[PDB]
PDB file of C-alpha atoms and ligand atoms in Angstrom:
ATOM      1  CA  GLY L   1      53.358  94.604 133.317  1.00 51.29           C
ATOM      2  CA  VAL L   2      55.060  95.488 130.045  1.00 47.70           C
ATOM      3  CA  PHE L   3      54.382  94.461 126.447  1.00 47.79           C
ATOM      4  CA  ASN L   4      57.377  95.216 124.150  1.00 49.61           C
ATOM      5  CA  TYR L   5      56.831  95.765 120.409  1.00 47.18           C
ATOM      6  CA  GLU L   6      59.816  96.389 118.114  1.00 47.41           C
ATOM      7  CA  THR L   7      59.907  97.365 114.458  1.00 47.39           C
ATOM      8  CA  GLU L   8      62.252  98.828 111.825  1.00 48.25           C
ATOM      9  CA  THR L   9      61.554 100.978 108.862  1.00 48.84           C
ATOM     10  CA  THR L  10      63.731 102.486 106.190  1.00 50.35           C
ATOM     11  CA  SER L  11      64.086 106.085 105.135  1.00 50.08           C
ATOM     12  CA  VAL L  12      65.679 107.621 102.121  1.00 49.98           C
ATOM     13  CA  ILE L  13      66.955 110.575 104.233  1.00 48.84           C
ATOM     14  CA  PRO L  14      70.376 110.511 105.894  1.00 51.41           C
ATOM     15  CA  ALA L  15      70.308 109.810 109.658  1.00 48.68           C
ATOM     16  CA  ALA L  16      71.548 113.181 110.976  1.00 50.51           C
ATOM     17  CA  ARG L  17      69.210 115.218 108.792  1.00 50.20           C
ATOM     18  CA  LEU L  18      66.220 113.028 109.534  1.00 48.26           C
ATOM     19  CA  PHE L  19      67.004 113.135 113.267  1.00 49.34           C
ATOM     20  CA  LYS L  20      67.175 116.983 113.143  1.00 49.43           C
ATOM     21  CA  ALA L  21      63.968 117.369 111.037  1.00 50.85           C
ATOM     22  CA  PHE L  22      61.636 114.564 112.168  1.00 49.80           C
ATOM     23  CA  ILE L  23      62.581 113.972 115.765  1.00 47.93           C
ATOM     24  CA  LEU L  24      64.127 117.207 117.071  1.00 48.39           C
ATOM     25  CA  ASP L  25      62.075 119.841 115.023  1.00 46.83           C
ATOM     26  CA  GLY L  26      59.180 117.331 114.705  1.00 49.81           C
ATOM     27  CA  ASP L  27      57.022 119.672 116.819  1.00 54.14           C
ATOM     28  CA  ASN L  28      57.091 122.321 114.056  1.00 51.61           C
ATOM     29  CA  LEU L  29      57.525 120.120 111.072  1.00 49.64           C
ATOM     30  CA  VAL L  30      55.088 117.262 111.634  1.00 50.84           C
ATOM     31  CA  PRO L  31      51.910 119.337 112.012  1.00 49.88           C
ATOM     32  CA  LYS L  32      52.871 121.365 108.929  1.00 49.94           C
ATOM     33  CA  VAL L  33      53.489 118.339 106.671  1.00 53.30           C
ATOM     34  CA  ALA L  34      50.930 115.844 108.013  1.00 53.45           C
ATOM     35  CA  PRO L  35      47.995 117.983 109.325  1.00 51.90           C
ATOM     36  CA  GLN L  36      45.552 115.186 108.469  1.00 49.00           C
ATOM     37  CA  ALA L  37      47.331 112.955 110.991  1.00 48.14           C
ATOM     38  CA  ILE L  38      48.587 115.428 113.649  1.00 46.92           C
ATOM     39  CA  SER L  39      46.589 118.670 114.171  1.00 44.60           C
ATOM     40  CA  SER L  40      49.089 120.314 116.558  1.00 43.54           C
ATOM     41  CA  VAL L  41      51.973 119.895 118.921  1.00 42.13           C
ATOM     42  CA  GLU L  42      51.963 122.174 122.005  1.00 46.15           C
ATOM     43  CA  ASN L  43      55.048 122.536 124.163  1.00 47.78           C
ATOM     44  CA  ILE L  44      53.659 122.527 127.737  1.00 46.24           C
ATOM     45  CA  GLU L  45      56.930 122.761 129.669  1.00 46.79           C
ATOM     46  CA  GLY L  46      60.651 122.557 128.796  1.00 48.16           C
ATOM     47  CA  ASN L  47      62.920 123.377 125.919  1.00 50.63           C
ATOM     48  CA  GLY L  48      63.186 119.921 124.337  1.00 50.23           C
ATOM     49  CA  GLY L  49      65.481 118.108 126.827  1.00 50.58           C
ATOM     50  CA  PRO L  50      64.578 115.344 129.258  1.00 51.47           C
ATOM     51  CA  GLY L  51      61.439 116.219 131.204  1.00 51.56           C
ATOM     52  CA  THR L  52      59.898 118.320 128.375  1.00 53.03           C
ATOM     53  CA  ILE L  53      56.134 117.833 128.055  1.00 56.67           C
ATOM     54  CA  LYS L  54      54.287 118.158 124.723  1.00 56.84           C
ATOM     55  CA  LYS L  55      50.623 117.763 123.970  1.00 55.73           C
ATOM     56  CA  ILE L  56      50.008 116.040 120.669  1.00 53.48           C
ATOM     57  CA  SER L  57      46.509 116.629 119.325  1.00 53.15           C
ATOM     58  CA  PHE L  58      44.769 114.546 116.646  1.00 55.49           C
ATOM     59  CA  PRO L  59      42.290 115.652 114.006  1.00 52.90           C
ATOM     60  CA  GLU L  60      38.543 115.526 114.535  1.00 54.35           C
ATOM     61  CA  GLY L  61      37.187 111.969 114.178  1.00 51.89           C
ATOM     62  CA  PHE L  62      40.289 110.184 115.433  1.00 50.56           C
ATOM     63  CA  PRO L  63      39.952 107.555 118.141  1.00 44.19           C
ATOM     64  CA  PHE L  64      41.779 109.704 120.673  1.00 42.97           C
ATOM     65  CA  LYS L  65      41.757 113.439 121.167  1.00 38.55           C
ATOM     66  CA  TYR L  66      45.313 113.916 122.394  1.00 37.32           C
ATOM     67  CA  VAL L  67      48.243 112.436 124.170  1.00 38.91           C
ATOM     68  CA  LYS L  68      50.946 114.058 126.241  1.00 40.02           C
ATOM     69  CA  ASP L  69      54.585 112.916 125.600  1.00 38.23           C
ATOM     70  CA  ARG L  70      57.409 113.410 128.145  1.00 41.10           C
ATOM     71  CA  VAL L  71      60.933 113.464 126.706  1.00 42.85           C
ATOM     72  CA  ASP L  72      63.162 110.971 128.551  1.00 41.36           C
ATOM     73  CA  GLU L  73      66.529 111.157 126.765  1.00 42.71           C
ATOM     74  CA  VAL L  74      67.994 112.750 123.653  1.00 44.33           C
ATOM     75  CA  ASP L  75      71.286 111.461 122.247  1.00 43.93           C
ATOM     76  CA  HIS L  76      72.541 113.737 119.473  1.00 42.73           C
ATOM     77  CA  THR L  77      75.618 111.602 118.847  1.00 42.82           C
ATOM     78  CA  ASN L  78      73.916 108.252 118.289  1.00 41.98           C
ATOM     79  CA  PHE L  79      70.568 109.728 117.078  1.00 44.22           C
ATOM     80  CA  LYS L  80      68.545 108.160 119.852  1.00 45.46           C
ATOM     81  CA  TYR L  81      65.394 109.688 121.256  1.00 43.23           C
ATOM     82  CA  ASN L  82      63.434 108.259 124.144  1.00 40.75           C
ATOM     83  CA  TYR L  83      60.046 109.567 125.258  1.00 40.05           C
ATOM     84  CA  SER L  84      57.014 108.398 127.142  1.00 39.62           C
ATOM     85  CA  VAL L  85      53.277 108.776 126.480  1.00 42.60           C
ATOM     86  CA  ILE L  86      52.156 109.683 129.984  1.00 43.87           C
ATOM     87  CA  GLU L  87      48.604 111.077 129.744  1.00 42.36           C
ATOM     88  CA  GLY L  88      45.642 111.262 127.447  1.00 40.80           C
ATOM     89  CA  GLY L  89      43.906 109.100 124.942  1.00 39.23           C
ATOM     90  CA  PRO L  90      44.464 105.476 125.862  1.00 40.12           C
ATOM     91  CA  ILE L  91      46.229 106.309 129.125  1.00 41.06           C
ATOM     92  CA  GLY L  92      44.058 105.603 132.123  1.00 39.22           C
ATOM     93  CA  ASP L  93      42.797 102.656 134.103  1.00 42.35           C
ATOM     94  CA  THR L  94      44.106 100.008 131.658  1.00 41.25           C
ATOM     95  CA  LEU L  95      47.350 101.611 130.409  1.00 39.98           C
ATOM     96  CA  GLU L  96      49.705 103.517 132.673  1.00 36.74           C
ATOM     97  CA  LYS L  97      52.325 104.673 130.196  1.00 35.46           C
ATOM     98  CA  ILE L  98      54.032 103.945 126.864  1.00 34.93           C
ATOM     99  CA  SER L  99      57.824 104.118 126.844  1.00 36.65           C
ATOM    100  CA  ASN L 100      59.220 104.627 123.363  1.00 33.93           C
ATOM    101  CA  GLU L 101      62.719 104.549 121.878  1.00 34.72           C
ATOM    102  CA  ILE L 102      63.680 105.613 118.379  1.00 37.66           C
ATOM    103  CA  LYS L 103      67.184 105.174 117.075  1.00 36.53           C
ATOM    104  CA  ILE L 104      68.186 106.255 113.569  1.00 34.58           C
ATOM    105  CA  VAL L 105      71.093 104.559 111.886  1.00 35.82           C
ATOM    106  CA  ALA L 106      72.948 105.438 108.680  1.00 36.70           C
ATOM    107  CA  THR L 107      72.950 103.037 105.699  1.00 37.81           C
ATOM    108  CA  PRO L 108      75.683 103.249 103.105  1.00 39.93           C
ATOM    109  CA  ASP L 109      73.277 104.136 100.287  1.00 37.68           C
ATOM    110  CA  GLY L 110      72.684 107.547 101.951  1.00 36.38           C
ATOM    111  CA  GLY L 111      69.460 106.548 103.657  1.00 36.47           C
ATOM    112  CA  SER L 112      68.752 105.484 107.245  1.00 36.60           C
ATOM    113  CA  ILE L 113      66.964 102.869 109.246  1.00 34.82           C
ATOM    114  CA  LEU L 114      64.706 103.690 112.148  1.00 33.22           C
ATOM    115  CA  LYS L 115      64.713 101.173 114.968  1.00 33.10           C
ATOM    116  CA  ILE L 116      61.683 101.581 117.231  1.00 31.87           C
ATOM    117  CA  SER L 117      60.775  99.999 120.543  1.00 33.09           C
ATOM    118  CA  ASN L 118      57.404 100.674 122.151  1.00 33.22           C
ATOM    119  CA  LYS L 119      56.743  99.393 125.661  1.00 34.55           C
ATOM    120  CA  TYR L 120      53.169  99.339 126.928  1.00 35.02           C
ATOM    121  CA  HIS L 121      52.931  99.501 130.707  1.00 36.83           C
ATOM    122  CA  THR L 122      49.609  98.074 131.746  1.00 37.35           C
ATOM    123  CA  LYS L 123      47.427  98.006 134.837  1.00 36.76           C
ATOM    124  CA  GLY L 124      45.145  94.998 135.379  1.00 35.90           C
ATOM    125  CA  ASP L 125      45.159  91.817 133.302  1.00 35.46           C
ATOM    126  CA  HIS L 126      44.721  94.042 130.272  1.00 35.59           C
ATOM    127  CA  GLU L 127      46.335  92.770 127.095  1.00 37.00           C
ATOM    128  CA  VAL L 128      48.022  94.631 124.149  1.00 38.85           C
ATOM    129  CA  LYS L 129      48.080  92.593 120.888  1.00 39.07           C
ATOM    130  CA  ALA L 130      50.289  93.139 117.793  1.00 39.77           C
ATOM    131  CA  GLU L 131      47.117  93.771 115.667  1.00 35.27           C
ATOM    132  CA  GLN L 132      46.175  96.903 117.571  1.00 36.87           C
ATOM    133  CA  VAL L 133      49.684  98.400 117.991  1.00 36.27           C
ATOM    134  CA  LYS L 134      49.653  98.261 114.172  1.00 35.49           C
ATOM    135  CA  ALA L 135      47.918 101.628 114.281  1.00 38.03           C
ATOM    136  CA  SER L 136      51.048 103.070 115.975  1.00 35.65           C
ATOM    137  CA  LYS L 137      53.222 101.793 113.142  1.00 35.20           C
ATOM    138  CA  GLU L 138      50.811 103.078 110.445  1.00 37.05           C
ATOM    139  CA  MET L 139      50.873 106.491 112.139  1.00 36.51           C
ATOM    140  CA  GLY L 140      54.645 106.543 112.415  1.00 34.40           C
ATOM    141  CA  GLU L 141      55.041 105.457 108.783  1.00 36.21           C
ATOM    142  CA  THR L 142      52.642 108.165 107.553  1.00 35.81           C
ATOM    143  CA  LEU L 143      54.496 110.834 109.512  1.00 35.55           C
ATOM    144  CA  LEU L 144      57.852 109.593 108.248  1.00 36.69           C
ATOM    145  CA  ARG L 145      56.832 109.610 104.584  1.00 35.86           C
ATOM    146  CA  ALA L 146      55.336 113.117 104.952  1.00 36.39           C
ATOM    147  CA  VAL L 147      58.631 114.367 106.461  1.00 38.42           C
ATOM    148  CA  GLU L 148      60.730 112.637 103.823  1.00 41.46           C
ATOM    149  CA  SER L 149      58.613 114.156 101.006  1.00 37.32           C
ATOM    150  CA  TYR L 150      59.140 117.609 102.512  1.00 37.32           C
ATOM    151  CA  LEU L 151      62.899 117.111 102.963  1.00 36.22           C
ATOM    152  CA  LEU L 152      63.327 115.840  99.370  1.00 34.25           C
ATOM    153  CA  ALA L 153      61.489 118.968  98.082  1.00 36.88           C
ATOM    154  CA  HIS L 154      63.233 121.523 100.328  1.00 36.23           C
ATOM    155  CA  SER L 155      66.883 120.722  99.911  1.00 36.90           C
ATOM    156  CA  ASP L 156      68.016 123.707 102.026  1.00 36.65           C
ATOM    157  CA  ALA L 157      65.962 122.586 105.069  1.00 39.03           C
ATOM    158  CA  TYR L 158      67.678 121.059 108.147  1.00 40.45           C
ATOM    159  CA  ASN L 159      71.244 120.801 106.829  1.00 40.09           C
TER     160      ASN L 159
HETATM  161  C1  DXC M   1      51.942 108.650 120.297  1.00 43.15           C
HETATM  162  C2  DXC M   1      52.282 107.900 119.022  1.00 43.15           C
HETATM  163  C3  DXC M   1      52.273 106.355 119.258  1.00 43.15           C
HETATM  164  C4  DXC M   1      53.427 105.668 119.948  1.00 43.15           C
HETATM  165  C5  DXC M   1      53.001 104.401 120.683  1.00 43.15           C
HETATM  166  O1  DXC M   1      52.095 103.601 120.350  1.00 43.15           O
HETATM  167  O2  DXC M   1      53.634 104.150 121.701  1.00 43.15           O
HETATM  168  C6  DXC M   1      53.541 108.439 118.286  1.00 43.15           C
HETATM  169  C7  DXC M   1      53.757 107.720 116.947  1.00 43.15           C
HETATM  170  C8  DXC M   1      54.575 108.707 116.054  1.00 43.15           C
HETATM  171  C9  DXC M   1      54.809 109.914 116.970  1.00 43.15           C
HETATM  172  C10 DXC M   1      55.141 111.282 116.343  1.00 43.15           C
HETATM  173  C11 DXC M   1      56.425 111.248 115.509  1.00 43.15           C
HETATM  174  C12 DXC M   1      56.659 112.614 114.887  1.00 43.15           C
HETATM  175  C13 DXC M   1      56.785 113.704 115.933  1.00 43.15           C
HETATM  176  C14 DXC M   1      58.052 113.457 116.783  1.00 43.15           C
HETATM  177  C15 DXC M   1      58.250 114.591 117.766  1.00 43.15           C
HETATM  178  O3  DXC M   1      59.445 114.404 118.545  1.00 43.15           O
HETATM  179  C16 DXC M   1      57.023 114.681 118.668  1.00 43.15           C
HETATM  180  C17 DXC M   1      55.773 114.858 117.835  1.00 43.15           C
HETATM  181  C18 DXC M   1      55.518 113.792 116.776  1.00 43.15           C
HETATM  182  C19 DXC M   1      54.375 114.290 115.880  1.00 43.15           C
HETATM  183  C20 DXC M   1      55.193 112.411 117.393  1.00 43.15           C
HETATM  184  C21 DXC M   1      53.964 112.380 118.311  1.00 43.15           C
HETATM  185  C22 DXC M   1      53.739 110.987 118.932  1.00 43.15           C
HETATM  186  O4  DXC M   1      54.871 110.778 119.754  1.00 43.15           O
HETATM  187  C23 DXC M   1      53.569 109.897 117.861  1.00 43.15           C
HETATM  188  C24 DXC M   1      52.267 110.189 117.063  1.00 43.15           C
HETATM  189  C1  DXC M   2      46.766  99.835 120.647  1.00 43.94           C
HETATM  190  C2  DXC M   2      47.442 100.659 121.763  1.00 43.94           C
HETATM  191  C3  DXC M   2      47.174 100.061 123.172  1.00 43.94           C
HETATM  192  C4  DXC M   2      45.830 100.443 123.796  1.00 43.94           C
HETATM  193  C5  DXC M   2      45.482  99.570 125.007  1.00 43.94           C
HETATM  194  O1  DXC M   2      46.293  99.416 125.964  1.00 43.94           O
HETATM  195  O2  DXC M   2      44.363  99.012 125.021  1.00 43.94           O
HETATM  196  C6  DXC M   2      47.166 102.173 121.660  1.00 43.94           C
HETATM  197  C7  DXC M   2      47.981 102.941 122.726  1.00 43.94           C
HETATM  198  C8  DXC M   2      48.462 104.256 122.114  1.00 43.94           C
HETATM  199  C9  DXC M   2      47.588 104.392 120.878  1.00 43.94           C
HETATM  200  C10 DXC M   2      48.003 105.438 119.835  1.00 43.94           C
HETATM  201  C11 DXC M   2      48.070 106.809 120.474  1.00 43.94           C
HETATM  202  C12 DXC M   2      48.328 107.878 119.414  1.00 43.94           C
HETATM  203  C13 DXC M   2      47.437 107.820 118.159  1.00 43.94           C
HETATM  204  C14 DXC M   2      46.074 108.373 118.551  1.00 43.94           C
HETATM  205  C15 DXC M   2      45.073 108.424 117.406  1.00 43.94           C
HETATM  206  O3  DXC M   2      43.848 108.990 117.885  1.00 43.94           O
HETATM  207  C16 DXC M   2      44.919 106.987 116.944  1.00 43.94           C
HETATM  208  C17 DXC M   2      46.269 106.533 116.409  1.00 43.94           C
HETATM  209  C18 DXC M   2      47.326 106.420 117.521  1.00 43.94           C
HETATM  210  C19 DXC M   2      48.626 106.097 116.799  1.00 43.94           C
HETATM  211  C20 DXC M   2      47.034 105.380 118.631  1.00 43.94           C
HETATM  212  C21 DXC M   2      46.972 103.927 118.122  1.00 43.94           C
HETATM  213  C22 DXC M   2      46.563 102.895 119.190  1.00 43.94           C
HETATM  214  O4  DXC M   2      45.196 103.106 119.627  1.00 43.94           O
HETATM  215  C23 DXC M   2      47.527 102.942 120.372  1.00 43.94           C
HETATM  216  C24 DXC M   2      48.896 102.445 119.911  1.00 43.94           C
END
């Protein structure tokens, strides 16, 4: 079955620029700015569109070694990006997949809001509780603030 967890968080970066830097070029940018959270991102197959597979590796000592993401949909107009965690780490006999959706919306102050939905597809009577998905949110937040810090400091990047 499916457990749906939704959150929002704010960014000080405008939606289009954040979408281009953090989501689209996130494969280059995230390991450079947050190497203590993400050790590398390997493109396995594809050019970034639906069906593209990436292997996200975590630093030594983390609970999980890696996950593989599959890009599902990329909407450049509405700054929506949908991807699934389909292998690795927690994926196995208790968790089949995680289907994720990020949408970035402009705020009139020149920042953005990130709307996130994470759907945990389980196998068995295995439960996913808000407490534990908190680590997903903490990760996301750390990555976001690392990207924002970079973008604030490198004004000519991703315009
Ligand atoms: C795999 C987790 C957890 C999501 C969940 O619990 O469902 C998510 C949380 C934040 C995600 C990252 C956001 C920044 C990057 C976005 C890129 O387009 C793909 C690589 C990165 C580095 C992502 C890798 C991976 O997709 C992460 C680490
Ligand atoms: C808490 C859920 C659900 C696990 C389950 O079904 O039992 C699991 C599923 C995906 C997991 C994430 C995968 C990517 C990351 C791996 C890191 O090495 C630890 C932090 C992250 C951000 C993990 C946090 C947490 O461990 C999650 C969100």
